[PDB]
From a paper:
Through molecular replacement, we determined the structure of YegTK267A at a resolution of 3.1 Å. The asymmetric unit, contained two YegT molecules, designated as molecule A and molecule B. Notably, both molecules were captured in nearly identical conformations, with a RMSD of 0.17 Å across 332Cα atoms. Notably, Lys267 is located in the loop connecting TM8 and TM9, which is distant from the substrate-binding site. This placement ensures that the mutation has minimal effect on the substrate-binding region. A structural comparison between two NHS members, NupG and YegT, revealed that both proteins share similar structural features, with an RMSD of approximately 1.57 Å across 316 Cα atoms, despite having only about 27% sequence identity. The protonation site, Asp315 in YegT, and the corresponding residue Asp323 in NupG, are situated within this conserved motif. Given that the measured pH obtained for the crystallization condition was 5.8, this strongly suggests that Asp315 is protonated. Notably, the side-chain carbonyl oxygen atom of Asp315 is located solely 2.5 Å apart of the main-chain carbonyl oxygen atom of Glu255.
The nucleoside proton symporter (NHS) family proteins are part of the major facilitator superfamily and are responsible for transporting nucleosides from the extracellular environment into the cell. In this study, using X-ray crystallography, molecular dynamics simulations, and biochemical assays, we discovered that the deprotonation of Asp323 in NupG, or the equivalent Asp315 in YegT, (another NHS family member) triggers a local conformational change in the TM10 region of NHS transporters. Notably, this protonation site is part of a novel motif (GXXXD) located in the middle of the TM10 transmembrane helix in NHS proteins. Further biochemical studies suggest that this local conformational change in the GXXXD motif plays a role in coordinating substrate release, ultimately facilitating substrate translocation.
Residue numbers in the entry:
A (entry chain B): 1 to 187, 193 to 403
B (entry chain A): 1 to 186, 193 to 403
Write the structure that this text describes.
Amino acid sequence: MKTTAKLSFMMFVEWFIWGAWFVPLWLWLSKSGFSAGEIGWSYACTAIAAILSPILVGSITDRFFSAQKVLAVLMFAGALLMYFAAQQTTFAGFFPLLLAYSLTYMPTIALTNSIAFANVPDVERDFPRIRVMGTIGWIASGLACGFLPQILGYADISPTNIPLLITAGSSALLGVFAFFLPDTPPKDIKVMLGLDALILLRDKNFLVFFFCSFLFAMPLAFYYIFANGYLTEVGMKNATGWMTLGQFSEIFFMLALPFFTARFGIKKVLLLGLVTAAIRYGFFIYGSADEYFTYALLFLGILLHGVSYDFYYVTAYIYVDKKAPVHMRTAAQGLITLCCQGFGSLLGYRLGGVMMEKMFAYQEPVNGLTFNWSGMWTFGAVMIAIIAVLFMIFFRES
Amino acid sequence: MKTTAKLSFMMFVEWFIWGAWFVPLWLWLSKSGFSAGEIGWSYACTAIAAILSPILVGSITDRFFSAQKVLAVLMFAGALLMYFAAQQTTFAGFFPLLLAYSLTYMPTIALTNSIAFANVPDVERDFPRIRVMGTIGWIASGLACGFLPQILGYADISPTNIPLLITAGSSALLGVFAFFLPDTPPDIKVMLGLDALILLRDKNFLVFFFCSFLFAMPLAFYYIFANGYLTEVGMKNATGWMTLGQFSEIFFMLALPFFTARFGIKKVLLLGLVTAAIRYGFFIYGSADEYFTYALLFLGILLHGVSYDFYYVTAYIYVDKKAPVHMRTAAQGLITLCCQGFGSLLGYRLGGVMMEKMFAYQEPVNGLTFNWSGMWTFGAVMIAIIAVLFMIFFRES
Ligand SMILES: CCCCCCCC/C=C/CCCCCCCC(=O)OC[C@H](O)CO
Ligand SMILES: CCCCCCCC/C=C\CCCCCCCC(=O)OC[C@H](O)CO
């Protein structure tokens, strides 16, 4: 029970619980009678909570409560709120409980990486090694949810609420484990996220980056709300655990990434992630698992998801850091996260969801598919292509 | 993972939770600057929740919620409320969260009895078996709290909050364990008493109601002052050694039926009374300075359970015997709500400010910050006078 290894367990569980439910959710909702647009709103809960929680963390670190004491009760509230949500037959009863849970979860991200940062001897020695534990625990929820139950004699739980239950149980666990976590002190103008960072848009490169990133987030939201549903509808078994190849891919390919970034330069690497997200979505157009070649395309798409994340998200953060004034880089990160990764995420979810029910929903299933999945992946791949070319020509740097 | 045993674990943890924090709370509250009165109110919280709880259980099921799901929700709520309370530094912050926790909790008791009752095949065979598991869990909390932390190299937790955190953790556990629980399905506030209020016109029933109302006020002295006294008298692991009363209740249950058939309910009721009196006398004279004092201390813990069985169960038996068969459960609810509930409330607070105002030592001497032996005198002959008042004023058949 060493203090640093304590930190690692709490990181692991913290992202374990978000994973346990985020990935399977579509299958249980479509099967329990939701429609594409209801489901889109359900995944939009995520983006709303993301953009709204800096406010909440102003509330939640401002007051004298130290982070570990807070995380215990936010975790307990989350277990309660989502158990309640998990028992919901309807969209009307289900949605507000998901939004409530989401609001009490997303501050914990900050809480937990605060407690890791404060109580670790060397930041560059231990912080990275703590924060990959988050990815590890995402993996663990995935394997627990797509592989473990079948190992004990049960069938795929993805079309059922048990993932919703796993997350609740894990919340409960992290709650109790917050007793044994070291003391972490906390650390009032609401306008910090935006106004600090809005006047950085005047630089041309920064604006093209900002708005092409914001466009990026909307097709890229298709993956998180549809990949598992489609993967299983097209015949891949244990899809919710096989999707951890994107996580393993991120982890392992990022060692290869810095040597990339040196040899080619940020504009090349920024659009390289773009092109492999395009390629990946194409793989999802044509893959359908009946034959080994289409199956291989499925797996390769998941791989290049982690490749694509490493190419774009991490260098993007770097770019903002080297490109922003030091007092203001935390502000700018807050900002691009806020709209790009928050409003672009919401746009992605609901654009895609109502677009599916309006233009793709099958009236009666054909060959196991109740959606023209290939068609939507193709929409998104095409749109990635043409936002990508704009960024190729509308922006340049050295 | 069988319906047979799943309920047993449920009852175990369910009363484990009440036990964890209830016995030790005095030590920590007192050792964090509280006063005897604020402590009295704190123990009174649980009685208030008991008082107000049928209201909450009459709104729990009316909206068609399955007992196991709502229980999961309530255990989670109690975990959170208990953590908050446990991080509290003064009575003003501590009290409201305790009251909230308790209100979340004591509907759980009913709920868990519902869930247990529904899903055993033979209820008169297998219900008692689940009922003992609650007291066994209460035993487990005692032991785990006043014995296990020394085993791991840590000093006594009874003066710290940790009981409070142990409570939170077990709340969270039973909460999660409610997922695996079998399915148990489910508006006049007046129903709990007015049914039974008209029963009081029998004079024996009034005498019994009134004198158990009196009896329950001294009787609360034990729960609120016993651990503090026992430890301040130098008994170590007191919080664990106090489970002997629980044990003795369990084992003395087998000698109860043959006791209750041999002299009736008058003698056996006041036998409950008398053993509670004399064990209070043992409390007035025991200490650990000498071996014999020590022997008194342990015997007084045993006589708790003996006194409890006698009174608490043959009284229930008496009202069932004495109540019309629709109204018997209403009758239960009434005497448990005012006698066991209001009497407890007034015992806790009466004693709290009693010791605050007329028993607090300016400067602790011989380890004692109170004239404990004085309070036990007060209580023991309060028991005595109520005992004789009962002695002549109550007739049987
Ligand atoms: C009151 C009116 C006065 C005018 C108001 C401000 C002028 C408008 C432009 C401001 C850029 C502000 C920062 C100027 C320097 C920016 C450089 C920067 O962004 O960081 C450098 C980084 O290394 C990249 O390579
Ligand atoms: C200012 C106080 C006014 C009086 C308040 C009344 C309450 C009782 C008071 C004192 C009894 C304490 C005396 C305890 C006897 C000590 C005897 C002793 O010295 O040791 C024991 C024995 O001798 C070993 O062999």
